[PDB]
Design a binder for these strands. Structure first.
Ligand SMILES: [Mg+2]
Ligand SMILES: [Mg+2]
Ligand SMILES: [Mg+2]
Ligand SMILES: [Mg+2]
Ligand SMILES: [Mg+2]
Ligand SMILES: [Mg+2]
Ligand SMILES: [Mg+2]
Ligand SMILES: [Mg+2]
Length: 50
RNA sequence: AGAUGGUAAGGGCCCACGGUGGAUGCCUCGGCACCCGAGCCGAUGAAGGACGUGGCUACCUGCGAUAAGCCAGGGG
């Protein structure tokens, strides 16, 4: 769990973004919603040791 | 008595200009053949797909719920 509880947080954030997108209120789309390239797989990469 | 000339609804032929049409000419990221290199993939789940994934994405190419992409090395 050295990298978890962070993607739970960032997937919570992306289900603030996808809420904000459906109503007409998401005015930085690719500036925010394509976080999941570097962010979000920011800490979805470790070698599963042991 | 007397004759040729005429009338063009429309037709014919020719000339001029159009439309329809897609031939011809000229192109090539396309294809064919030949010669070279290369030559297997799969329980470490293949070939092939269905579905999906872009913020809006219909389709194609991707790519798999990490879903036009992730991480590291190398080239630029
Ligand atoms: Mg003339
Ligand atoms: Mg003509
Ligand atoms: Mg024509
Ligand atoms: Mg051949
Ligand atoms: Mg396959
Ligand atoms: Mg797809
Ligand atoms: Mg998409
Ligand atoms: Mg979408």
């Amino acid at each position: 769990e050295a990298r978890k509880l962070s993607p739970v947080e960032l997937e919570k954030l992306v289900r603030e973004k996808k809420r904000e997108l459906m109503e007409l209120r998401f005015q930085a789309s690719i500036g925010q919603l394509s976080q999941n390239h570097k962010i979000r797989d920011l800490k979805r990469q470790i070698a599963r040791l042991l």
